[PDB]
Design a binder for this molecule. Structure first.
Ligand SMILES: [Mg+2]
Ligand SMILES: [Mg+2]
Ligand SMILES: [Mg+2]
Ligand SMILES: [Mg+2]
Ligand SMILES: [Mg+2]
Ligand SMILES: [Mg+2]
Ligand SMILES: [Mg+2]
Ligand SMILES: [Mg+2]
Ligand SMILES: [Mg+2]
Ligand SMILES: [Mg+2]
Ligand SMILES: [Mg+2]
Ligand SMILES: [Mg+2]
Ligand SMILES: [Mg+2]
Ligand SMILES: [Mg+2]
Ligand SMILES: [Mg+2]
Ligand SMILES: [Mg+2]
Ligand SMILES: [Mg+2]
Ligand SMILES: [Mg+2]
Ligand SMILES: [Mg+2]
Ligand SMILES: [Mg+2]
Ligand SMILES: [Mg+2]
Ligand SMILES: [Mg+2]
Ligand SMILES: [Mg+2]
Ligand SMILES: [Mg+2]
Ligand SMILES: [Mg+2]
Ligand SMILES: [Mg+2]
Ligand SMILES: [Mg+2]
Ligand SMILES: [Mg+2]
Ligand SMILES: [Mg+2]
Ligand SMILES: [Mg+2]
Ligand SMILES: [Mg+2]
Ligand SMILES: [Mg+2]
Ligand SMILES: [Mg+2]
Ligand SMILES: [Mg+2]
Ligand SMILES: [Mg+2]
Ligand SMILES: [Mg+2]
Ligand SMILES: [Mg+2]
Ligand SMILES: [Mg+2]
Ligand SMILES: [Mg+2]
Ligand SMILES: [Mg+2]
Ligand SMILES: [Mg+2]
Lengths: 53, 53, 124, 210, 124, 147
RNA sequence: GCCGUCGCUGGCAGUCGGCAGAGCGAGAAAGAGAGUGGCGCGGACGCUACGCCGCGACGAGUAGGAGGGCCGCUGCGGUG
RNA sequence: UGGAAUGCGAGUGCCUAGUGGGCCACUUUUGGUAAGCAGAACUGGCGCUGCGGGAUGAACCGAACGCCGGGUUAAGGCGCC
RNA sequence: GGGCCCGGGGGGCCACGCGUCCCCCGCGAGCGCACGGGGUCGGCGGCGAUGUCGGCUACCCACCCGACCCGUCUUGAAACACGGACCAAGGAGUCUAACACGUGCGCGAGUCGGGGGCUACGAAAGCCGCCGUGGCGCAAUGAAGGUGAAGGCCGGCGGCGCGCCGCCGGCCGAGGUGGGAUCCCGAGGCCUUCCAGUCCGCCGAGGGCGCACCACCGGCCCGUCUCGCCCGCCGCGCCGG
RNA sequence: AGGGCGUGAAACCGUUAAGAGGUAAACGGGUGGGGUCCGCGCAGUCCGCCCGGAGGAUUCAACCCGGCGGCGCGGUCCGGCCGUGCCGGCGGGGCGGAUCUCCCGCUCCCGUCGGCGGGGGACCGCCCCCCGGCCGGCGACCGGCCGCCGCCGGGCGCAUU
RNA sequence: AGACCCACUCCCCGGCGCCGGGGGGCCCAAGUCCUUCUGAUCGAGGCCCAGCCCGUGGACGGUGUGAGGCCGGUAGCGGCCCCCGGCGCGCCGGGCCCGGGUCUUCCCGGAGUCGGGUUGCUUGGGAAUGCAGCCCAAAGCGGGUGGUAAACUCCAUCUAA
């Protein structure tokens, strides 16, 4: 959970352009499906409009 | 992990609760394998009781 | 890791079928279509896949190369075997045992190859 | 009815509270409406600062806050007088005036006087008729560089005078802070009665003397 | 608290193990060199432990280091260190019951008159 | 969510979980805190001693700003300054003591819980406790009163 | 015999294969230890570990509590 | 020589519904001529509970209940029903 | 009768190498049968294309045994207690606020931007940090004025008379007893031709550090009561400690 | 779908068909009889190995060429990225600090001297980037060569395979 | 107001003329291509490398299903045409003859109101928060407030009717 390899940048023609970028550390962050589903659950209610009889 | 966020006033990546998730590798390592008792993989099914008399 | 990725997809996957008290997985490189850690064809570094050839002659054996785990385009090596029934299995048996490439999938691959070959015989 | 242990609660729902529930579903609309009015006001008054007129520094009342300064309402007439700005002219060049406010101490008076003089230095002043520059108008060279300032004008901040470490003298060491505090309370508590006792005793002794 | 329990005689060069979070204590001045294993360590407690030369393990690293738990010092946080345990026991209105009542506000006007002084009815 | 609640499990069960004998009636016992000195007395005396009666003086127009006096113990005193302040003064030879101004940190009174590191310090504050003053003096410090 | 529950907070990561060697149920602690001197290319299933397997006991129920529903209805985000 | 027998894993803490009309039997027992009456003690029951017997029956006798096969019983029975 | 049924002078023994000293007088090979860790046959027969074979349950009918109509209040309902002629659709623990405890997640002596501001889905989301004002927590206690959370030892001095109080300077230092998961040490020991002694492990009497938690005993903070001797000073006080 | 016409339920009714009928009907358990249909039944399974008879080949192994792949403690091959490692850097920098400190604006006082605010600099902590040495990974992170092995394509093998 | 120094010509009203957001109207991409299902289709299949064509337009609606390309639309700092408004620039007839500082001398305030008693209502406002009726009824270094009634005394802060 510490390795950060080099990622290739592809040109608009689908070929590697020769440039490389070290993998950002965020892509090694803990993957928590329970947290994501909790946040997605509660944030998705914030764009609701009220209804009432 | 080493450098805090620069564009967020005060933030850093969430820490890992488990650094190595390769459970198969962890269990097959000599360190753990040396501490194990021998497995008991023999099934002792029910014996039918026959009357000795 | 494989174990981490299984914990994310064991019950949430576009390939998961839960129906009639049965569970199946429709992803490639799953030798039994089984929603299982052993037979999942996505989460392991090495995987074995047996498929029928694009034409109904022979089988295609897929093995995951070691290096490009994050590069789907170059990840899988496909080999077409269109020999007789016994010869096809012998190649598959050797590609697994001799290379020690998932030796625990040996019979699953061999049983799948027989089922694909048997399917390609004329239907009576 | 109460059930086992718990808190005794007195909710204030014995009126027709449902008749007067203020929902906040118009909150995002209000925020857009206010923002749209800030931008339209900034365009109208440009290049004058959008935040508005410069405000003076003031010390918050009461002992809970008198350690903090903040923005006041307007500069006192004394501060404008000391800085040589006419009170009626002041507003016309973006200076807030407060005829009510007093200046009890010199330090706060001079802090705001310096504030005004500094503001008067950064003030770019355009001619009333662009083709006819006048005595006080800023030069043409510095008018082409005029831009609208965003945020409060010369923001007010609480700055603490960092005091560097020093050797402790024997005088400070022997100081008795708690004992000094306790005696100060007693003297302030007994001041009036003590003088009342001194006055009566003097009269008592005098009547015996004479 | 970890330093206090890891400073007792005979516990040198042992791994402190807590199934929980290691918080920081600003009231401490000097942090010695510890070797700890925890589920979580607060951001400021990590810098202090590491700055002193200590090591912070994760429970998967403890298994590789100490498969059987040898050379460890298992530690627990205070369990009765919670506001709720102030409110448990004999009801506050019983003799010698130092239980904490449930009051919306705290002050002279909030459950102090009758039953809490002899001057108003009684006390116990 | 209502799909996780008892009401979904009380479907087809007569009485909806309130009993066949006592039933669920409107307000048996009174509304709110009724009955305190009456049929609800045991609850109030058992769990809310002191609830009834009056104690102490009244104060009209209380202004809580006037009594504002946040306090800090001596065990947390050195957190009001940077870490490099304490180590630099710990390792300096002149004997110069750093100034800790509690009012700048938002405290008015210094209290004596805890122990101080063996290190001279100059403490400013509106108020001090007796044991706080002795402990600050025990390490060679000085107490300074501000207004 | 079969179903379920409870218990053993039971067993299985050892599928350690031709870089091989098949055991750890057995009355009675602790090593199928390490060393130093005196032709064939083969070997079922398994393991959704939230899984699979074994053994033993047990099973009435109003009011009431709890668990599990690959029970059912309508709409939303994803997916098929 | 864990200092009688026997049996059994225990301790502990939170939150908590319903209930707060009961009634019946052996023994003991108050009032009353007595009551399928009113009131108590003990245990056990019915209430909440089916099942075999008492023809029938809230409580009696036997016995308590997952869905089944074989065997044997309890209390009761074996002219015919 | 009991003494491996003491010792001497026809019938069963889970006796059967031997060198010895002497009480007393560590591996043979095979093969086969089975009252042996729960059933098999390496045993057979008949019938079958237009009237016959199989089909639990389901449709109708018959018979034997069983069998009173539900919901409800009730000690007790099949009741001569009440509602119910029948069918469809509708029909009853919800939502807001407060509180309590439990559980899950985030961060952690902190935490929270909820109000405000900045920058189709989107009224979303993102950001603020000299926007953390503010809430809750980090301190209690008293009606209040207010106060507001360990000590011991060494050396020296003043007073009273080896002991006590006060003042100085140096050392150590957040309590103890009982129980206590876990951990640590290890008397001895875990075999294979026989001895010596190693490297790794492994069990273990006894002995230690003792988590959390509980019981008990001390300590400290605030109110109040009793007793009493001192210490401070810009205010010598109906002062303060 | 024939003008209150999409679909067209139940209760209730007409007719047709089958069955039955003196303890109101209905109901649980166990069979039996009869129908409605279903098996789209009616000489009854499939699979592996081996023996034998008949045939027929995009014919077997072994060798040669080429591609791809796995593994290598290659006992210690080269090159790479790279260490949420450790060391030496006159290293070229960003962030933070309640650690210290030559320039200016305003201001009190005689043309001076002192105070507020505004900036360098030094120092410390952390991070990024450059350079050198050890140990290290490449199993969330690989190339070239060499070796072994496997697979595939093409040759050659032409028949007791 | 006066004296003394100092500084001042653009500020507005009514008319007249010229130059750079709002309402309305009209328009602006691309398949009805080849097979085929259907009562009819907007369905299915196809449209060389490449990938039918447009796409800043794949919102929606209509049309004999189910349509980015059939029609309306949708997109666009797209276009054209009217009307209104806003903002500048000149000409004419008018008004104003406008200020700052320092001294000298002058002037300065709201009454049947305040305030007080009592009554009634009202407030969290408690020896009376606010309001109202009746009675009494002001002062001018005064008056009001200073959350416990009152006398004396300092202070603070405003200036009611
Ligand atoms: Mg209740
Ligand atoms: Mg129930
Ligand atoms: Mg009811
Ligand atoms: Mg309930
Ligand atoms: Mg009730
Ligand atoms: Mg009742
Ligand atoms: Mg209720
Ligand atoms: Mg049950
Ligand atoms: Mg009775
Ligand atoms: Mg009842
Ligand atoms: Mg019972
Ligand atoms: Mg019973
Ligand atoms: Mg009878
Ligand atoms: Mg039976
Ligand atoms: Mg009958
Ligand atoms: Mg009948
Ligand atoms: Mg009823
Ligand atoms: Mg009755
Ligand atoms: Mg009934
Ligand atoms: Mg009756
Ligand atoms: Mg009734
Ligand atoms: Mg009726
Ligand atoms: Mg309905
Ligand atoms: Mg909680
Ligand atoms: Mg919207
Ligand atoms: Mg129709
Ligand atoms: Mg209709
Ligand atoms: Mg119709
Ligand atoms: Mg008929
Ligand atoms: Mg068009
Ligand atoms: Mg359409
Ligand atoms: Mg088409
Ligand atoms: Mg369309
Ligand atoms: Mg199309
Ligand atoms: Mg168009
Ligand atoms: Mg348009
Ligand atoms: Mg006025
Ligand atoms: Mg008035
Ligand atoms: Mg009224
Ligand atoms: Mg009222
Ligand atoms: Mg007063």
């Amino acid at each position: 959970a510490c390795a950060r390899p080099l990622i290739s940048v592809y040109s608009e023609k689908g070929e590697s352009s020769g440039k490389n970028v070290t993998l950002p550390a965020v892509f090694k962050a803990p993957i928590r499906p329970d947290i994501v589903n909790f946040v997605h659950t509660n944030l998705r209610k914030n764009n609701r409009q009220p209804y009432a009889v | 992990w080493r450098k805090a966020a620069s564009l967020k006033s005060n933030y850093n990546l969430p820490m890992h609760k488990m650094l190595n998730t390769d459970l198969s590798r962890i269990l097959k390592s000599p360190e753990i394998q040396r501490a194990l008792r021998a497995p008991r993989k023999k099934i002792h099914r029910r014996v039918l009781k026959k009357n000795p008399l | 890791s494989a174990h981490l990725q299984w914990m994310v997809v064991r019950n949430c996957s576009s390939f998961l079928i839960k129906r009639n008290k049965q569970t199946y997985s429709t992803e490639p490189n799953n030798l039994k279509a089984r929603n299982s850690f052993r037979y999942n064809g996505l989460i392991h570094r090495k995987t074995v896949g047996v498929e029928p050839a694009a034409d109904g002659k022979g089988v295609v054996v897929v093995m995951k190369r070691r290096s490009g785990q994050r590069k789907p385009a170059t990840s899988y090596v496909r080999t077409t075997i269109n020999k007789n029934a016994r010869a096809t299995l012998s190649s598959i048996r050797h590609m697994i045992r001799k290379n020690k490439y998932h030796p625990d999938l040996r019979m699953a691959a061999i049983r799948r190859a027989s089922a694909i070959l048997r399917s390609q015989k004329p239907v009576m | 009815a109460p059930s086992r242990n718990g808190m005794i609660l007195k909710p204030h729902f014995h009126k027709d509270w449902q008749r007067r529930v203020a929902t906040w579903f118009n909150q995002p609309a209000r925020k857009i409406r206010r923002r749209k009015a800030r931008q339209a006001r900034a365009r109208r008054i440009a290049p004058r600062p959008a935040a508005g007129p410069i405000r003076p520094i003031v010390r918050c009342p009461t002992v809970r806050y008198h350690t903090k300064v903040r923005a006041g309402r307007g500069f006192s007439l004394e501060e404008l007088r000391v800085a040589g700005i006419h009170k009626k002219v002041a507003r016309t060049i973006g200076i807030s005036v407060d005829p009510r406010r007093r200046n009890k101490s010199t330090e706060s008076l001079q802090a705001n006087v310096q504030r005004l003089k500094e503001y008067r230095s950064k003030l770019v002043l355009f001619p009333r008729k662009p083709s006819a520059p006048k005595k006080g108008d800023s030069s043409a060279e510095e008018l082409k560089l005029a831009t609208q300032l965003t945020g409060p004008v010369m923001p007010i901040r609480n700055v603490f005078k960092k005091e560097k470490a020093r050797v402790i003298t024997e005088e400070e060491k022997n100081f008795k802070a708690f004992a000094s505090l306790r005696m100060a309370r007693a003297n302030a508590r007994l001041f009036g009665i003590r003088a009342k006792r001194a006055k009566e005793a003097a009269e008592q002794d005098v009547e015996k003397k004479k | 608290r970890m330093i206090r329990k890891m400073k007792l005689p005979g516990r040198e060069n042992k791994t402190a193990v807590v199934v929980g979070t290691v918080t920081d204590d600003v009231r401490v001045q000097e942090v010695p060199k510890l070797k700890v294993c925890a589920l979580r360590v607060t951001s400021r407690a990590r810098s202090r432990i590491l700055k002193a030369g200590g090591k912070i393990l994760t429970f998967d690293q403890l298994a590789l280091d100490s498969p059987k738990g040898r050379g460890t010092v298992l530690l627990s946080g205070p369990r009765k260190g919670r506001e709720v345990y102030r409110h448990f026991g004999k009801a506050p209105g019983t003799p010698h019951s130092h239980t904490k009542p449930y009051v919306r506000s705290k002050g002279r006007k909030f459950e102090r008159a009758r039953g809490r002084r002899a001057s108003r009815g009684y006390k116990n | 969510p209502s799909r996780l609640r008892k009401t979904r499990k009380l479907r087809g069960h007569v009485s909806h979980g309130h009993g066949r004998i006592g039933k669920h009636r409107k307000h048996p016992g009174g509304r709110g805190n009724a009955g305190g000195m009456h049929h609800h007395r045991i609850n109030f005396d058992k769990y809310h001693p002191g609830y009834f009666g009056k104690v102490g003086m009244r104060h009209y127009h209380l202004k809580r700003n006037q009594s504002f006096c946040p306090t800090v113990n001596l065990d947390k005193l050195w957190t009001l300054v940077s870490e490099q302040t304490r180590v630099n003064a710990a390792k300096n030879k002149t004997g110069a003591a750093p100034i800790i101004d509690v009012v700048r940190s938002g405290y008015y009174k210094v209290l004596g819980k805890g122990k101080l590191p063996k290190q001279p310090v100059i403490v400013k504050a509106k108020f001090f406790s007796r044991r706080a003053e002795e402990k600050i003096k025990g390490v060679g410090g000085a107490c300074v009163l501000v207004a």
